[PDB]
Design a protein around this ligand. Sequence first.
Ligand SMILES: Cc1cc2c(cc(C(=O)N[C@H](CO)c3ccc(S(=O)(=O)CC(=O)O)cc3)n2C)c(Cl)c1Cl
Ligand SMILES: Cc1cc2c(cc(C(=O)N[C@H](CO)c3ccc(S(=O)(=O)CC(=O)O)cc3)n2C)c(Cl)c1Cl
Lengths: 204, 210
Amino acid sequence: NGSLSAAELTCGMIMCLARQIPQATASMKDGKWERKKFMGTELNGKTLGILGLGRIGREVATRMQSFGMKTIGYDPIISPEVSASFGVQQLPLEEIWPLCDFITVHTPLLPSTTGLLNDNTFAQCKKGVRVVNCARGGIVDEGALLRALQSGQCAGAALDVFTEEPPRDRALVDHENVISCPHLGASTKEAQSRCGEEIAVQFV
Amino acid sequence: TPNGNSLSAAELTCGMIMCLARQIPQATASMKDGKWERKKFMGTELNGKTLGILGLGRIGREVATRMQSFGMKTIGYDPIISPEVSASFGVQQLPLEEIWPLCDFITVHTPLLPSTTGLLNDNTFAQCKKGVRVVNCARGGIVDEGALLRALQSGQCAGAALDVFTEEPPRDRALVDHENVISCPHLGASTKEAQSRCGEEIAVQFVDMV
Ligand SMILES: Cc1cc2c(cc(C(=O)N[C@H](CO)c3ccc(S(=O)(=O)CC(=O)O)cc3)n2C)c(Cl)c1Cl
Ligand SMILES: Cc1cc2c(cc(C(=O)N[C@H](CO)c3ccc(S(=O)(=O)CC(=O)O)cc3)n2C)c(Cl)c1Cl
């Protein structure tokens, strides 16, 4: 609740996967002018899968809906009626993977949510899928993710969170198709002020 | 045919607005360099902030509706679009001189004409808020390149996002190389969907003659 900053970064990560804005910026700083290399894809009419439909997940959904993206997802707690109010069609996990163009994770870190995006899951996904993780490290299996990026099963990945912070295994962050942030989800003057203030109202 | 690439240009602008606010390309470059800087890449929350959209045609109106879902206050200017017509798509129109002090973010969506050339100048940046962020995904020259560098070097402009330049590729790299500047090699229309739409709409016009 103290959320909108993690949701805005996730949305900004989605826009970066579609047009490769960080890669295009790094290319420019190197004195290059590569038009052909950074030919992207439109967000209008594309399917975004949202696994975890809490406070973050619903804000991402409403923001990405204004872009013409189809918002579908899953949550074991959130009823189909609650998800339908904010325009998210709930389907079972196995029916979500092949329809998705973009996938974002917004669940807490739990053993059941650890490795949610694995080799078996990625194989069920559409070829050239884009994955976002601005939640917690370990939700998307890093080993399974690098393999999918290597094979082309996953076209791109935007990672704010990792299993180890700072990560020693640089294979993911070094990959050209990977967008990265050093855990910047909550890193805003507006959210940290709200987090610092909301800890006092729950106290009293 | 400008209608065919309007949605792709609108999306990239929104992308550039997010990238300025959370320093995503700068954070990626730092991570790619093998660094971990949390309290260095301090972002800003877009909710409640004011976005000024100068030019309210197809791209200007599509940027507004997307940024409205982020809780951004969308204000702007267009001498052709009426204040009642702009209000129908959530844009509060005010005279050009009143827009500058209210903006946190400014984005230009006008065609290139002598009247639009140098729209963001030294006199224009002086009326702006200290720490304003500027987006130019329309045509190089609407935002005066010389004035923009002065604003970025004095702290008057906290950051710039430029897809376009007066010279393409730009010979002068002083803007491109600045730490608070993010850039793209004219990717505004560079998408399969817009390229196929523009490619179809131009072909039918040539067929229309006979
Ligand atoms: C296997 C599996 C288990 C799952 C989920 C989803 C949840 C869950 O806990 N849902 C609730 C919302 O009902 C929730 C609560 C706090 C956060 S959060 O702390 O990340 C910040 C936030 O988003 O508010 C996110 C989501 N669980 C236990 C999914 Cl999808 C799968 Cl597949
Ligand atoms: C001094 C001054 C003069 C201006 C404007 C605005 C226009 C203008 O022509 N407006 C119309 C829409 O009424 C229009 C047409 C095509 C495009 S476009 O699609 O080619 C570019 C894009 O949208 O990126 C954008 C806008 N004029 C002549 C402004 Cl604001 C100022 Cl200050």
